[PDB]
Write a protein that binds this ligand. Sequence first.
Ligand SMILES: CC(C)N1CCN(Cc2ccc(Cn3ccc4ccc(-c5n[nH]c(N)c5C#N)cc43)cc2)CC1
Ligand SMILES: CC(C)N1CCN(Cc2ccc(Cn3ccc4ccc(-c5n[nH]c(N)c5C#N)cc43)cc2)CC1
Lengths: 202, 212
Amino acid sequence: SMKIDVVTIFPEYLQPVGLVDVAVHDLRRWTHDVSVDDSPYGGGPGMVMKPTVWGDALDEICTSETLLVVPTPAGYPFTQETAWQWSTEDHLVIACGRYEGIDQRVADDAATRMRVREVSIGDYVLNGGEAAALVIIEAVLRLVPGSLLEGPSYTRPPSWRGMDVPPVLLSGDHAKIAAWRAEQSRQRTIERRPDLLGFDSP
Amino acid sequence: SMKIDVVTIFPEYLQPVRQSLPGKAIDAGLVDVAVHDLRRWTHDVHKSVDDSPYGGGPGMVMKPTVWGDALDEICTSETLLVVPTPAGYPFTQETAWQWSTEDHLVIACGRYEGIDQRVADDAATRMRVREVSIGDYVLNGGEAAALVIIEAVLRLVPGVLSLLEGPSYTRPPSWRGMDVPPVLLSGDHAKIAAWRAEQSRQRTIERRPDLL
Ligand SMILES: CC(C)N1CCN(Cc2ccc(Cn3ccc4ccc(-c5n[nH]c(N)c5C#N)cc43)cc2)CC1
Ligand SMILES: CC(C)N1CCN(Cc2ccc(Cn3ccc4ccc(-c5n[nH]c(N)c5C#N)cc43)cc2)CC1
């Protein structure tokens, strides 16, 4: 059983969402002035989300048992191992940042009370944490109770536009099929992800 | 000026993209994102998009005939066809930069075990095709990957949307017993830059030693 709370200033973005429930919260619900961001101390372009409103939101939503997940391009990598680890958690809270990110003290303060994980879903830049939250939720939820790249897959018809399904796949020879699929997998891995086999990246 | 077509059996999943597009960019004709239900191209009354895998095994494979028709209609020779797949080449910021100058992206979202390989192979004989993965985790299908790709690419298109960055701070200067690092308030901007560089170095070593 898992509860996931997502906190964001763009709740509309999270709409692509019995053993698990997901709730989306508008961060602005915790403001009292009639501004969630300001210029960074030390200078630089763009804006930083103030810790104040985040603190109030997380105070209400989180407990000491919560795993606080904070997407950030500067995070530890989020991988399938991470997804397995998080799949048995009772409560994930995903704090989605915007602008140039969230004041570091939010994560620091939270860590005095609960476990906090700053993670990145990949080596590219997004405009905010929301798309990352969707990826994280999908990867985690498909593992909730109740190495090499996959090779190519085929289905009917056996000939299409003059392109044949590899004849071994029609042979019914399980061992030959297993061996061919292993070869395709190791072949694809060397070409596309040599790092997975401990080789230099292109 | 970019057109993105997305093909998926879950068009409602692509709602956030439409949500994040500024009216100014659309009205300026800088971007157009269209989402297409793959079932529009099915052949049968049951609107079938999947079938059992040759060679056996669990799961299902998306049908080449349906996908072939969809891509035939939507793609041209100038299209960059993007196919998310857990077996893809890595999608990185370099990829996003390259794709940000394209006239036409088509993103083919798979489900189940993926798409019959002949779809991409056939397409590759008359347009540029890119099978890519957005990270080392497993999703249910290509839609969440498409959301990530679209955002990373479009934010590099003017006015449409190394080391790790260290921590950032803003007001108030003191909060829950934690002061902003005094160096940031020092007015010594060479020192501030050096402090930020060291923070970046330390964070990269701790979180991403692979980048070093
Ligand atoms: C890699 C560094 C060297 N460069 C790049 C980052 N630059 C700063 C910068 C630029 C934009 C944003 C937008 N933003 C706001 C909140 C937020 C949360 C997650 C993500 C996010 N992006 N990519 C991922 N894999 C993410 C995850 N998970 C992005 C977010 C935040 C921060 C600085 C330079
Ligand atoms: C990774 C393999 C070694 N093992 C794992 C589990 N099985 C493979 C398997 C499992 C689920 C799916 C679901 N699926 C259908 C279409 C599709 C497109 C993209 C993605 C996707 N997942 N992760 C990414 N970074 C992606 C991207 N981009 C996933 C997709 C497709 C394939 C078998 C083996």
